[PDB]
Structure 1
Amino acid sequence: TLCGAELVDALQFVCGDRGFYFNKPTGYGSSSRRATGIVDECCFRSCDLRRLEMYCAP
């Protein structure tokens, strides 16, 4: 399993110039979603490259 700094490092290693995707909505206020999402998906279970690279901007 990988947790902490490794994550972003591994993340960088899988994206490079591709960039990181963001669902940029405009919205207003705290109604738009909130602040598990990653550490559930990577820190508590080993995440394969198939499950991880999806966070990369196209």
Structure 2
Amino acid sequence: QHLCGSHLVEALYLVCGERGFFYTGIVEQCCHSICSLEQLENYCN
């Protein structure tokens, strides 16, 4: 449940579907800490 780097990016692609996304705090909450699926969708477009 730690999402960073290439793996964070794989996760975004997955949960964002058609919505798309931007990638460069999502890192604090989901890479440094464990976020949920719901927390993750909130970074799509």
TM over 0.5: yes
TM-score range, shorter chain: 0.7 to 0.9
Detail structure 1 runs of 4+ shifted over 3 Å in the superposition.
none
Q: Relative contact order, CA 8 A, sep 6+: which one is greater?
A: 1
> Which of the pair has more CA radius of gyration?
1
Aligned CA RMSD, in angstroms, stands at: 1.5
TM-score scaled by length of structure 2: 0.72
Structure with the higher fraction of residues in strand conformation: 2
Aligned residues: 42
**Percent identity, aligned pairs only?**
57
Unaligned runs of 5+ in 2: none
Structure with the higher fraction of residues in helix conformation: 2
TM-score scaled by length of structure 1: 0.60
